Amino acid sequence: SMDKNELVQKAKLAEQAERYDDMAACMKSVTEQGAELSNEERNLLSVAYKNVVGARRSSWRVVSSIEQKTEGAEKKQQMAREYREKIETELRDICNDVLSLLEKFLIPNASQAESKVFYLKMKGDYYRYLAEVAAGDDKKGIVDQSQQAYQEAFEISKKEMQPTHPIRLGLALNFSVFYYEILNSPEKACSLAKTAFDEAIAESYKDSTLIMQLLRDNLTLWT
Amino acid sequence: MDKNELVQKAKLAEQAERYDDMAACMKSVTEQGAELSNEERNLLSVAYKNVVGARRSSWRVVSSIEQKTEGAEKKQQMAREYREKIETELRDICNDVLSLLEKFLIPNASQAESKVFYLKMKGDYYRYLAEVAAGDDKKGIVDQSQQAYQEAFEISKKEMQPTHPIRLGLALNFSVFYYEILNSPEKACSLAKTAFDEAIAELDTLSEESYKDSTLIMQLLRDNLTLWTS
Amino acid sequence: DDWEIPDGQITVGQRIGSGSFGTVYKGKWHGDVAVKMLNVTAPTPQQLQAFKNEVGVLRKTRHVNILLFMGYSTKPQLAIVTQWCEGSSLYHHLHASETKFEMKKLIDIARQTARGMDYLHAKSIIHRDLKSNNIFLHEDNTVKIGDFGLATVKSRGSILWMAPEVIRMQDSNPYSFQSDVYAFGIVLYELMTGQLPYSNINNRDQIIEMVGRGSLSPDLSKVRSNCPKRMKRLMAECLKKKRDERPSFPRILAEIEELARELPKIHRSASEPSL
Amino acid sequence: DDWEIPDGQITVGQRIGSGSFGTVYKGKWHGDVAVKMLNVTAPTPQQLQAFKNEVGVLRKTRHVNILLFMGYSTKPQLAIVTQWCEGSSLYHHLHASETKFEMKKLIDIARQTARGMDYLHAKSIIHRDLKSNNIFLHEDNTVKIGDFGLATVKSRWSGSEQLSGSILWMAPEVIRMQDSNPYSFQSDVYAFGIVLYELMTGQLPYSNINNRDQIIEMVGRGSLSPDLSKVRSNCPKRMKRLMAECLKKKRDERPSFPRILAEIEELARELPKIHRSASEPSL
Ligand SMILES: OCCn1cc(-c2ccc3c(c2)CC/C3=N\O)c(-c2ccncc2)n1
């Protein structure tokens, strides 16, 4: 019910108030506006939904672990499960919002390659997030779409982007953990992770320093 | 439905850091009408303290942005309207807790421990309402905060030892009321220093668990006294 | 002598706690200071021995991780004066306020403490009461070991940090460098555990009785999940039942320092985060 | 054998710079240490007496705002070893990175420096080279006064010194070299006045001037004084008055460090609090 500038201002204000549900709503309206987002607006949408869905992922992991360690108690296990599926539903709704925005606005209105690899990566990450909680009859489908979008972005990633480039470095990180976690293909995942790290060492200044540490931690722990 | 199922789902919401869910569970448990247990009391307290603390922190941030925005008249209008959204949430949370206190907790408190704990909670939530109230209802809310604090303080000094963690916490929050709300540092330091000094005397007395409980609030009193005298 | 402070120069402020042989206050003397003071009217001959022994030990200490002794006074009543440390004791943060420290900060605390007692043992100083209560935090930046009232130079009620041989006291002097290493192992237990050891046993005499025989040892499974495996092994090494299987502080310090280097951000797989 | 450290125990690392009478490196000795050392095979009687005086002075310093002396060595070369300070000198922060210090932290830095020089003068120690480079920030939080190579105990037979290039902090009497003792407690107070100038303006004094050698002559003369009009507006009025008091041209009207300290302590309490009170947390 307001200007794109008014919604972006309320989004930045919600970000500093750490009210990520408000920021997500603002950026959702701004994207339903139809215009290509700027790097700042893109970045705000990313921060918003990542925090919104990360809270639910953290709660899901905690409550699932509690479900596991419930021994000799149905009703304890019954409460944890039903709570896990409540969080699970929230988890799905968030990702469905984000994937609908990705498919109806973000990827199609991306002019340069940078934007469309970023949005396809996000596409892969949210299908991935869906992946973690998928049941199994529909699990397969979601995982398939995750890697399809991921790799489609991957194909364009190391073709127009410099080895130091963080969107690229991050896409690899997410694609590698996609293979390692979601599926179980450590070799491919480890292949990818070491490949990207060494190509980065070969050739943002502070941004890349920390993504290479995340790559070095990953391989150290994966092997 | 069961009270124990509500307590267990409250603990699970606490583990998942979904404090709105924990607060709802505990509100259901307190609306059943029975006197709460010590664990149930502390779960309700933790839940609403997190629920309201999120809003207090966000309110402070956007309020600061509101006063510090000069050039832009439209931006300052947006920060004002978002501050009022957060404020409305804040007030509803506090009014929820104060209604729970008045209707169930305070009247059902048999022991003195319980009645100082709940009167102090009443002082805290009226103090959170004082932190954002402006002009008209401000005086009424400040008075209700001070009144609840004062009654709990008298009952603390008459049936609780100076080291008792509830009395020490009442001292800490009442001194913070004096400093931040009434803007009277001297009276705040007087109350804080008296409670801390009276506890330090008898600190050798306590068991090793009682010592952990008491020292956790005494360190906060001395931190406050260090900040207020500096 | 050259460390005595004339009476009248120190303004003693609020009483804040207790120490080995006296009560501790905050004071002003060219800034802030901590003052441990015995309030007895006429010190008895044992109290003057304790006080001058502590001063003698402290005047040999000059290290960033030792509570810096600044002077002493005797005039109104006997008094030891140190630098002021505004954060509390490690025991406070761990077991009374449960300050949630990151594993990186816990490793740094253990590392600094290890430096402090490497310095101490290298000058032949045995502390004999090392515990998280005697470890002070200075503005969440430096660790400082204190209260040397029970310390000594080795010349020819805090039970949970006492090594088994010290509990037995069957030997004339059970205290040694190794005993200190065992207390350090217990402090590492607190850092990597979040809890004090033997949380289930209720009474003090029972716990003394069982650790002295060896029936009871700390439960290491209670170590937090992100604790580096080298640190857990080092705890095991510092806590071995028999004194001579314990490492020396040069070796403890070197491995914790090496160990502090290379610590991962988090334990499991990690995805890109910009937020 | 009092504070002497045996040879072989100290692992000396990278060269970090120079100090008064030696070059400074990083070292390992029960943790990190700083080492000021003289890179010579055989010390002359003058370098050996200078080193002996500095050890004698440092052995009397035991204060949080004085760089903690930890020991000395004679064996390979003469060396003074101190605590290590991660960070930079206040000179580096103010004029080499323009680290944005808040006025509150600037007040605190001045207060800690004042505590250090209060301690020093109460033990009859004159530093005689107090400058922003000899003030080190440990963990960008704590002030540590260092480099005691030109320091002395106030004695009848005091001293005898390489004043060199760092002369901005030198008081007019020290520039003129015409009175009984050009160095004194008041010379230290004027050096302190200059470091508050740096703290409150952000720049060195006599910065905007055309010629450089005469500058001395002008300060010597009394013709030139720091431009107190470049103090920033958020600098408290008591602090600007106090720095003027520490910079006054005739030694005897400058204040002493007990009351400089009391004034910095009292005015620091009148600045708005940056934090809020703490309330009872969740059990
Ligand atoms: O543990 C909480 C109570 N508490 C006790 C002390 C304490 C304990 C022993 C000793 C000193 C101070 C000074 C002299 C001494 N031993 O000789 C401190 C403290 C230490 C350093 N800075 C500020 C406070 N807090």
Ligand SMILES: OCCn1cc(-c2ccc3c(c2)CC/C3=N\O)c(-c2ccncc2)n1
């Ligand atoms: O201009 C900056 C170069 N720089 C010089 C020193 C220094 C200066 C004098 C002295 C020592 C170190 C040690 C002994 C001494 N005086 O006797 C330091 C420093 C001091 C403390 N921690 C880290 C570095 N940096």
